[PDB]
Amino acid sequence: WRAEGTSAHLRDIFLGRCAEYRALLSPEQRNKDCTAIWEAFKVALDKDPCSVLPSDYDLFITLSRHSIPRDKSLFWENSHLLVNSFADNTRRFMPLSDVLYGRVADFLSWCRQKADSGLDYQSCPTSEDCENNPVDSFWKRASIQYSKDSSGVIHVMLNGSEPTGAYPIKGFFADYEIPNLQKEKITRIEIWVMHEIGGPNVESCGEGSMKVLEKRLKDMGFQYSCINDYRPVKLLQCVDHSTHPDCALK
Amino acid sequence: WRAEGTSAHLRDIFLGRCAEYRALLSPEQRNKDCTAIWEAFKVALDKDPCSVLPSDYDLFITLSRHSIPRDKSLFWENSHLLVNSFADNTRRFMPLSDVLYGRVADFLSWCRQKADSGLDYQSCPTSEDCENNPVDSFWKRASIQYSKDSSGVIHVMLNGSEPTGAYPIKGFFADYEIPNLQKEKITRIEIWVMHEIGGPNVESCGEGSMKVLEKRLKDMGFQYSCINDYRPVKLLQCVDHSTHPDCALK
Ligand SMILES: *[C@@H]1O[C@H](CO)[C@@H](O[C@@H]2O[C@H](CO)[C@@H](O)[C@H](O)[C@H]2NC(C)=O)[C@H](O)[C@H]1NC(C)=O
Ligand SMILES: *[C@@H]1O[C@H](CO)[C@@H](O[C@@H]2O[C@H](CO)[C@@H](O)[C@H](O)[C@H]2NC(C)=O)[C@H](O)[C@H]1NC(C)=O
């Protein structure tokens, strides 16, 4: 297999993350059974590493699903760390990584051995090794739920320094989230196209792939807007380049 | 008891934080038994809620003790969240909360029932209810170790907008960390007096309590320097005040 082996101590981490997240939930929905949640997730670890479908995680979702505050959803592509850092544990925004069912698996890997019953810590199938592996099918199901339950102002953070452009036509955002947005409960979609400090400006609002994304969103009838290097996030990026002309203060 | 009662699901959170932190440790010091570490921590939990001494966590420390990179220690007072956020999980600096024995207990509470084998999820003694309570004794032992294991350039983040002064003369830094610094392996000490955006300038370098701190450190033979609103941290504060004049970019 051509992808990371399952994460060491998967269960403790999962349960730990789940416990800490409960505290964030409001009491009226704080009653989440982390053990039951782990057992529903655990199902994919009993199947063939190439025979897991997004629907296998349905129970998991039912047991961990909770509401996402209006105008608090934050989608993204090629900016994982900047998103978690900026969102700051649900304080600023609530991206998938900061929603119960996403928090428990963020950055982790998992899959069962090809022929044995135990977990494969050596490697796990990549989308290329086979389409229906545990990790991809997981995110597809989680990405779908996240989009469906998002409302208000939809924020999206894309990478303008990414060599393949800011919008991957075949990413999770394009194939599993955009098609699941409830236009009925979405006011407008705002995009933040970020560039590395000094780093390359491969694409800015309205250029290359950004035209394709913008066109799709507008055809689907969404109110659309795009901002290059949205200030708050730029300031966070700047923390690591305090002495760079782009980061100098008045 | 007047302080917060023990954290719900304390064991799962503990083991989860411990397992996750293991990945951040050097392969040489990656051999950490979380379960064993927990059992050691529990040795203080089985005692009377007002009869726990720092020495009770000696075993805990022993089994979780790991080295701290040179020049990466970051001490502080009245700026817990700003430090955790700036340290960015051992990426920039490694504060007590980003060291194994600190990470497993950051923000949590714990204590045995006044008179019963179970944990008291109702309330835990504060420093007033009694001095030798589980939580305060914990941080004393942890602070002493963190201090003893620090080296190179020592950094300290203080809140210059703190009504009672930047340097608490009766806090953990003053009573349990400064006394334990190893001058022999310390090059210099640098202070960062931070102020809230716009917030009050109660004290700055060379004023009030700062005069006391500087004089104490100089009397001990350390090289000293103090910076007002250290830039990188300022930028991080600015993330939440992007439009404020103190945060305008050039
Ligand atoms: C935005 O995309 C760029 C380009 O892919 C990322 O920067 C690269 O990151 C890799 C892995 O750390 C490095 O090997 C390259 O040297 C980087 N290139 C450049 C030009 O910096 C960047 O990390 C992405 N930004 C975020 C927030 O994810
Ligand atoms: C620095 O100290 C100030 C003053 O104690 C802190 O700000 C106060 O925090 C309390 C508790 O949340 C608020 O109710 C007050 O409104 C705040 N006042 C002011 C003037 O800010 C501040 O949180 C501290 N900064 C850090 C980073 O810990």
Side-chain angles (χ1 to χ4, degrees):
Chain A
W1 291 146
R2 296 166 182 54
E4 295 186 310
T6 77
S7 300
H9 307 285
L10 177 58
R11 189 163 171 291
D12 293 320
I13 300 182
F14 186 102
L15 290 171
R17 291 189 180 185
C18 185
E20 292 205 62
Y21 195 86
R22 256 185 79 178
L24 297 180
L25 288 168
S26 57
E28 50 263 57
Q29 55 185 179
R30 180 138 64 214
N31 180 39
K32 285 295 187 296
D33 192 324
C34 289
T35 294
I37 286 176
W38 155 254
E39 247 128 52
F41 168 86
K42 197 176 179 176
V43 70
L45 300 185
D46 289 311
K47 297 177 164 293
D48 176 78
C50 285
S51 305
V52 182
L53 298 170
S55 64
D56 291 304
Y57 295 106
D58 287 319
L59 213 209
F60 168 68
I61 302 301
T62 295
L63 297 177
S64 56
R65 178 192 186 178
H66 72 250
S67 60
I68 307 172
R70 195 161 207 267
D71 314 314
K72 286 301 191 181
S73 291
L74 175 59
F75 297 77
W76 54 276
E77 293 277 30
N78 307 312
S79 336
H80 206 168
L81 294 177
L82 186 52
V83 170
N84 289 356
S85 238
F86 179 58
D88 187 42
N89 201 47
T90 70
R91 266 199 64 253
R92 302 195 185 101
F93 294 79
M94 193 170 298
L96 182 51
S97 51
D98 284 330
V99 148
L100 182 50
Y101 51 90
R103 168 67 64 80
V104 300
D106 208 25
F107 283 116
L108 304 181
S109 313
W110 60 88
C111 67
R112 187 203 81 192
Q113 299 184 62
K114 216 191 310 299
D116 192 56
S117 58
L119 288 172
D120 191 326
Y121 293 85
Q122 185 50 43
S123 67
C124 286
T126 185
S127 185
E128 264 205 300
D129 290 311
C130 66
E131 185 173 298
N132 301 315
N133 65 77
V135 167
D136 292 336
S137 287
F138 173 92
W139 290 116
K140 290 179 178 177
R141 179 70 184 85
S143 284
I144 294 168
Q145 201 58 46
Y146 183 78
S147 312
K148 289 193 179 190
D149 301 338
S150 294
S151 68
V153 176
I154 299 302
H155 301 92
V156 184
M157 183 190 294
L158 301 185
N159 195 327
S161 299
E162 168 53 37
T164 58
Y167 176 66
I169 43 81
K170 282 309 208 304
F172 283 107
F173 180 54
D175 301 333
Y176 298 90
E177 308 186 309
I178 281 175
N180 285 288
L181 290 179
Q182 308 293 293
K183 186 191 171 185
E184 41 270 46
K185 60 194 185 73
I186 292 182
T187 54
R188 63 182 176 81
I189 301 177
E190 177 181 298
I191 315 293
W192 304 327
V193 179
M194 312 302 303
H195 300 106
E196 295 304 294
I197 302 302
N201 168 9
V202 179
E203 280 191 357
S204 287
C205 285
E207 310 173 329
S209 65
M210 287 308 296
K211 282 192 69 192
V212 178
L213 166 52
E214 164 167 36
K215 180 165 177 55
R216 231 240 275 204
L217 294 188
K218 285 189 182 177
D219 288 340
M220 299 171 97
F222 282 106
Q223 188 182 315
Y224 179 93
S225 79
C226 186
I227 303 172
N228 288 305
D229 302 296
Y230 176 53
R231 199 50 154 277
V233 178
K234 177 57 65 187
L235 291 166
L236 182 61
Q237 287 178 302
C238 274
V239 170
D240 287 307
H241 299 288
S242 49
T243 69
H244 185 294
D246 298 329
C247 298
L249 300 176
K250 287 183 180 179
Chain B
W1 301 159
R2 295 110 70 175
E4 226 284 291
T6 140
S7 299
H9 320 297
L10 178 61
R11 196 186 98 104
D12 296 319
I13 293 176
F14 189 101
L15 295 171
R17 291 184 180 181
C18 181
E20 283 204 75
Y21 193 81
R22 278 194 63 175
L24 299 183
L25 286 167
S26 50
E28 303 74 282
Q29 268 156 181
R30 191 119 72 196
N31 61 311
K32 295 292 181 293
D33 177 352
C34 292
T35 307
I37 289 178
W38 164 253
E39 221 63 51
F41 175 80
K42 201 150 61 179
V43 170
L45 261 186
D46 300 327
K47 301 188 62 184
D48 170 73
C50 278
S51 299
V52 182
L53 294 163
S55 42
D56 290 316
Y57 295 96
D58 289 327
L59 279 162
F60 167 71
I61 294 297
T62 300
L63 288 171
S64 55
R65 219 245 262 217
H66 73 258
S67 72
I68 307 172
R70 190 165 214 276
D71 308 310
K72 287 170 187 168
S73 288
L74 172 49
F75 292 76
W76 58 272
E77 288 285 10
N78 309 309
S79 32
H80 195 168
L81 291 166
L82 181 58
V83 166
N84 280 188
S85 198
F86 178 65
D88 195 43
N89 196 38
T90 69
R91 217 177 107 280
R92 302 195 183 95
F93 291 81
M94 186 180 301
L96 181 52
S97 48
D98 288 341
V99 158
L100 188 60
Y101 49 87
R103 172 65 62 78
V104 302
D106 203 21
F107 285 120
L108 311 179
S109 301
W110 59 90
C111 66
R112 186 203 75 197
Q113 307 203 58
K114 204 297 200 301
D116 188 57
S117 57
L119 300 176
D120 194 318
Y121 297 80
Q122 188 52 54
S123 62
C124 290
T126 64
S127 179
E128 275 187 290
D129 289 307
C130 63
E131 197 188 319
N132 302 315
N133 55 72
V135 165
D136 288 320
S137 286
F138 178 83
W139 293 117
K140 290 179 187 179
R141 245 262 62 176
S143 290
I144 296 180
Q145 201 50 60
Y146 183 77
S147 298
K148 290 188 174 185
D149 297 340
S150 302
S151 66
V153 177
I154 300 289
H155 304 87
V156 188
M157 190 191 297
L158 303 184
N159 193 333
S161 302
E162 169 52 49
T164 46
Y167 173 61
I169 75 175
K170 299 307 164 201
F172 272 128
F173 182 58
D175 302 333
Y176 295 89
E177 306 184 306
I178 284 182
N180 287 282
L181 296 163
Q182 316 274 284
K183 193 151 68 72
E184 51 176 301
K185 60 186 187 180
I186 292 177
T187 64
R188 69 181 169 81
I189 303 182
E190 177 182 298
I191 312 298
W192 304 331
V193 180
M194 304 302 297
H195 304 102
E196 299 302 292
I197 302 309
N201 170 27
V202 179
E203 270 181 347
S204 302
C205 290
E207 316 186 321
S209 56
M210 289 312 304
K211 286 190 61 188
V212 178
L213 176 52
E214 169 168 38
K215 187 156 173 289
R216 183 183 179 184
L217 298 184
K218 286 187 182 176
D219 290 337
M220 290 172 85
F222 287 108
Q223 186 198 296
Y224 177 99
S225 68
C226 181
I227 306 168
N228 289 311
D229 298 288
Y230 184 43
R231 204 40 153 272
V233 175
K234 180 51 64 184
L235 290 163
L236 178 52
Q237 295 179 299
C238 279
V239 177
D240 288 311
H241 300 275
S242 64
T243 63
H244 190 289
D246 289 356
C247 299
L249 292 169
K250 195 186 173 186

